């Protein structure tokens, strides 16, 4: 199955499925060590996954493009998802997302 | 009623209804010709498009995720790229299909 259809778990983790966390255009930057090692087994995974798009929304909400580089042919995507600041758990949701965004920068 | 990112477009609740008019601005979607806009996931080639959409795990694993707080609220930003498989015997058809939908809105009201 292609990379975009993989699901990370304890036995096949985020790094294995999706590469090291990092800053470059081809890399993902999301996840602290616990999420990287556990994937969808991570204790707070469903609280993160609520923000992941359906296939329909992915193609409906995003700015989609095609690029061709020496490495290959790429379907590019970009977008933004608004958090509901009336959700009771809003403050915690933001805290959780921020804990995982660029977590790798403090990997010792 | 569902959060925008969990909606599913269909003939009953089409791409415009679920995700707004296509156009060139940000958070504005640019993907879909008139047939896909009207049909969503009922579109005849929807599976050949959906093969490129990430799982929840992949979306958070592959993408560049950010958080933008602005006068309108708090936004989770995402950017990334999905590699097509150059060795897939249907690669040429995939490229044609995606290109047919990217910025299709430019050609119709």
Curated annotation (Swiss-Prot), chain A:
Residues 4-84 are annotated as: Putative NLRP3 binding. Disulfide bonds: none annotated. ADP-ribosylated. The ADP-ribosylation is retained in the virion during infection. Phosphorylated on serine residues by host GSK3A and GSK3B. This promotes the solubility of homodimers that would otherwise aggregate. Host phosphatase would dephosphorylate the protein during assembly at M bound membranes. A motif (Nuclear localization signal) lies at residues 1-8. Transmembrane segments: none annotated. It is found in: Virion; Host cytoplasm; Secreted; Host extracellular space. Residues 1-108 form the CoV N CTD domain. It comes from the Viruses. Residues 2-105 are annotated as: Dimerization. Homodimer, homotetramer, homooligomer with RNA. Both monomeric and oligomeric forms interact with RNA. Interacts with protein M. Interacts with protein E. Interacts with NSP3; this interaction serves to tether the genome to the newly translated replicase-transcriptase complex at a very early stage of infection. Interacts with host NLRP3 and ABHD8; these interactions disrupt the association between NLRP3 and ABHD8, increasing NLRP3 stability, ultimately leading to increased inflammasome activation. Packages the positive strand viral genome RNA into a helical ribonucleocapsid (RNP) and plays a fundamental role during virion assembly through its interactions with the viral genome and membrane protein M. Plays an important role in enhancing the efficiency of subgenomic viral RNA transcription as well as viral replication. Attenuates the stress granules formation by reducing host G3BP1 access to host mRNAs under stress conditions. Belongs to the betacoronavirus nucleocapsid protein family. This is Nucleoprotein. It comes from Severe acute respiratory syndrome coronavirus 2. The gene is N.
């Amino acid at each position: 199955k292609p990379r975009q259809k993989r699901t990370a778990t304890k036995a096949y983790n985020v790094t294995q499925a999706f590469g090291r966390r990092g800053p470059e255009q081809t890399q993902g930057n999301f996840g602290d060590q616990e999420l990287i090692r556990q994937g969808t087994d991570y204790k707070h995974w469903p609280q993160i996954a609520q923000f992941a798009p359906s296939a329909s929304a992915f193609f409906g909400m995003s700015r989609i493009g095609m690029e061709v580089t020496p490495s290959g042919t790429w379907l590019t995507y970009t977008g933004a998802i608004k958090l509901d600041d009336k959700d009771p758990n809003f403050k915690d949701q933001v805290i959780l997302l921020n804990k995982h965004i660029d977590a790798y920068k403090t990997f010792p």
